[PDB]
Design a protein around this nucleic acid. Structure first.
Lengths: 218, 260, 134
RNA sequence: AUUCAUAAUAACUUUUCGAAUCGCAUGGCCUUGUGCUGGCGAUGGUUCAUUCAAAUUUCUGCCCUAUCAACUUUCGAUGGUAGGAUAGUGGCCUACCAUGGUUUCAACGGGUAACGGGGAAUAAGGGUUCGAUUCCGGAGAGGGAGCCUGAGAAACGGCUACCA
RNA sequence: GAAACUGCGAAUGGCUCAUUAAAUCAGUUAUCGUUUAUUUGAUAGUUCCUUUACUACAUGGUAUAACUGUGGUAAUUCUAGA
């Protein structure tokens, strides 16, 4: 079928056209969440280890962990769930899906690689493909670049260069939760207002008590 | 009906907003704020239906976005926020202060007050109650509460609260002699006295209010709204005085006024 | 054209809306018409307009003929007039450029066209193009 | 007219918060830190109350039909306790206990090609008839059933399954 | 500023009058039975620790969308995989 092999050391993913009967065979009788070596599937794969990641059936229906009984099934799925895309608030919908087990009923399965064998995969394992960005928050960057609590990350930023067509310039994230005297001043206002309202109501109660003592005098 | 009627029907709107069967589809749907909309009187209706400044809602919206107003100490950017009785409208680039109070027809009259007197208003106390924290508060007739009153204040009387931080000032009780304005129904708009109150408890007493021409009328307790002592209105009074013109006297006034 | 008599009833000045407003009584007794740009010019010369921030729109023609009645405004501050007053009468007055756009139905069609399409959309388009290739 | 408000008291809490939230900005004094201090308005934050929503009831009131005179409780019919249980009143539901409700003032049952009012028209008047549809309001998205987020959703151009 | 994640909304309204004979509906009521997004009249010295060698408080931590690249099937506001 169509194997979609994902190598996360490179963030790479590739398609392959698995055409051999006896070698698509050996995948039989396995589950989702299961690891096997692609060894007798290919001398090039010899040693390579994949944990089965998913697949869409011959009609497109997916597989999913704990969806055994190797043929389709219709199930009510929700938000924070695979293979159902909620569309409104509190949306909770029945739709179909294929079984969690191996079978010849996908056009397409995807595997993620675990261990690497002796040979190399021409297009997939070779490349080096990025996180097109880096983080944004002050803390994230402190950790992403190994700094102390006070190292003032501001310059460490790996910033996106861009030529307009020729005109080159730089920009970068809006580091949120980075300390400012503005944060200081607003927390300070909070503490102010706290004690100040305390004392205003304290004096008002004092006045009211004085008035009460006056009335008692009368 | 799973919700609020998010609009309002023409030939459902207030007949006292002084509007037409003509003129489109709808009324403003007053969104949230203090006064009750049937007892409120919002801004576009003053601006456009009582005092006539602007044509489109687009006009009135950019007006309010530049905020040409104060009302009892604050603007508001809802085109039809619920303002109302004894509120103190001020309009600054024009320098007009109007006070809000019913006509002798029940219509909120165009009654100019001064920017002095744009600093105090009547508050007709609904209950002076023992709040939490030992905060003794008192709620009033414009959507409010306030603490540390003159604790001699008690229910159905009215007080002189200022504008913006409030801070209760001298008040007017409810007994034989209090100068009256009336605020609901047929005796709506009227002015008179408290020559007696018939306390019909369980809710909703009654009061005989007698106008300055010695004609008497029984009004609802919460229709009653004293406004000072006899010969001492705490504020300025309208054209009409709520002295209850008959159409006879109105027609006589027409055929007298028109000419010379 | 014997004469124009363009009179102001209810001359009211609003600093809030930043104009002098009134009711325009055009006695155009037997001329041909009302001719609103010439009337712009006259109200300019009588109070002050430098016509662009005048606003007169509603000179409807009386029965028996020769009289038209409508409203008039004379704003200050041509850019205030711009901001306040609406692109359609602005391009009627011609000091603006009225834009070219498809019909409400064309735009609601486009909405339906859009309504199949979550996410940035190039991610939708590029992969379906690869697929349509093969 | 509350054992109402009211809050403390001593305990308990898979502990709820009390802002790890935003923008223009940049003043002040020296002990020269980057010190602390510091405005305007953006969003959240608990309770009331209000406004905007929400529920039932006191109370009332609808043609004809008796060729429907007897209705009501098996399985809640009436009610109590106690529980569960609601936004709360409550057989709303559950166990235990008692026999219950109305009415010749027409109940119960059936029909209604039955939403009524404000209105249409006559027309001294008196009085009558129709009122689906734009004011007052409502119930509703084939027929059920079951189903989340919200403060309010059995929604349907939001949902599960069956029937056609 | 394509777009997402989420705030929210989509519970609008508009047309019918199936049922139904105190049900819906009208009112004069009236909740001291009662939830309340939304708006604001108000509306916030207590946080942690057996009370000296204590906890990021210059504010502490990852988890992923939209996003890149790898998908399907006769076919979809379908959907796998790094």
């Amino acid at each position: 079928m169509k194997l979609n092999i994902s190598y996360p050391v490179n963030g790479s993913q590739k398609t392959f056209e698995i055409d051999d009967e006896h070698r698509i065979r050996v995948f039989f009788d396995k589950r989702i969440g299961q690891e096997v070596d692609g060894e007798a599937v290919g001398d090039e794969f010899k040693g390579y280890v994949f944990k089965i990641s998913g697949g869409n059936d011959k009609q497109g229906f997916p597989m999913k962990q704990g969806v055994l009984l190797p043929t389709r099934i219709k199930l009510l799925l929700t938000k924070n769930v695979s293979c159902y895309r909620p569309r409104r608030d509190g949306e909770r919908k029945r739709k179909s899906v294929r079984g969690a087990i191996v079978g010849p009923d996908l056009a397409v399965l995807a595997l993620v690689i675990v261990k690497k064998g002796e040979q190399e995969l021409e297009g997939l394992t070779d490349t080096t493909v990025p996180k097109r960005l880096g983080p944004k928050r002050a803390n994230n960057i402190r950790k992403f670049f190994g700094l102390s609590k006070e190292d003032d990350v501001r310059d460490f930023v790996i910033r996106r260069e861009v030529t307009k067509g020729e005109k080159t310039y730089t920009k970068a994230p809006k580091i949120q939760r980075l300390v400012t005297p503005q944060r200081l001043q607003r927390k300070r206002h909070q503490r102010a207002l706290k004690v100040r309202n305390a004392q205003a109501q304290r004096e008002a109660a004092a006045e009211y008590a004085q008035l009460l003592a006056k009335r008692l005098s009368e | 009906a799973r919700g609020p009627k998010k609009h309002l029907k023409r030939l459902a709107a207030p007949h006292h907003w002084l509007l037409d069967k003509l003129s489109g589809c709808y009324a403003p749907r007053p969104s949230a704020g203090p006064h009750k909309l049937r007892e409120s009187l919002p801004l576009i209706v003053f601006l456009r239906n009582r005092l006539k400044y602007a044509l489109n809602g687009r006009e009135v919206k950019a007006i309010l976005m530049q905020r040409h107003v104060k009302v009892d100490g604050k603007v508001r950017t809802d085109t039809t926020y619920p303002a109302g009785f004894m509120d103190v409208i001020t309009l600054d680039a024009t320098n007009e202060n109007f006070r809000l109070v019913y006509d002798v027809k029940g219509r909120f009259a165009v009654h100019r007050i001064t920017d002095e007197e744009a600093s105090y208003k009547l508050g007709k106390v609904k209950k002076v109650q023992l709040g939490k924290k030992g905060v003794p508060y008192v709620v009033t007739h414009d959507g409010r509460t306030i603490r540390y009153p003159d604790p001699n204040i008690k229910v159905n009387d009215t007080v002189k609260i200022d504008l913006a931080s409030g801070k209760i000032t001298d008040f007017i009780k409810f007994d034989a002699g209090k100068l009256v304005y009336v605020t609901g129904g047929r005796n709506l708009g009227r002015i008179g006295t408290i020559v007696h109150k018939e306390r019909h408890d369980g809710g909703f007493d009654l009061v005989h209010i007698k106008d300055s021409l010695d004609n008497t009328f029984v009004t609802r307790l919460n229709n009653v709204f004293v406004i000072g002592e006899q010969g001492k209105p705490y504020i300025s009074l309208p054209k009409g005085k709520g002295i209850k013109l008959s159409i006879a006297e109105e027609r006589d006034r027409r055929r007298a006024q028109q000419g010379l | 054209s014997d004469a124009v008599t363009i009179r102001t009833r209810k001359v009211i000045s609003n600093p809030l809306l930043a104009r002098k407003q009134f009711v325009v009584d055009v006695l155009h007794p037997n001329r041909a018409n009302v001719s609103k740009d010439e009337l712009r010019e006259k109200l300019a010369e009588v109070y002050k307009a430098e016509k662009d921030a005048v606003s007169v729109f509603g000179f409807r023609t009386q029965f028996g003929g020769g009289k038209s009645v409508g409203f008039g405004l004379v704003y200050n501050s041509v850019a205030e007039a711009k901001k306040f007053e609406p692109t359609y009468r602005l391009v009627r007055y011609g000091l603006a450029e009225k834009v070219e756009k498809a019909s409400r139905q064309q735009r609601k069609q486009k909405k339906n066209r859009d309504k199949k399409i979550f996410g940035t959309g190039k991610r939708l388009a590029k992969k379906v193009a690869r697929r349509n290739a093969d």
